[PDB]
Write a structure and sequence with these properties.
GO terms for molecular function: ATPase binding; enzyme inhibitor activity. Helix content is about 55%, strand content about 0%. By secondary structure, the protein is mainly α. The longest helix has 17 residues, at about 10-25.
Length: about 30
């Protein structure tokens, strides 16, 4: 982790797109 931004979005941005799609994309409207 040195001189290379956007290198941890996977865990972060996924847990965020997963959390969201969950509360609402799991209900009855997939992504």
């Amino acid at each position: 982790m040195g001189i290379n931004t956007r290198e941890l979005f996977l865990n972060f941005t996924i847990v965020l797109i997963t959390v969201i799609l969950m509360w609402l994309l799991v209900r009855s409207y997939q992504y």
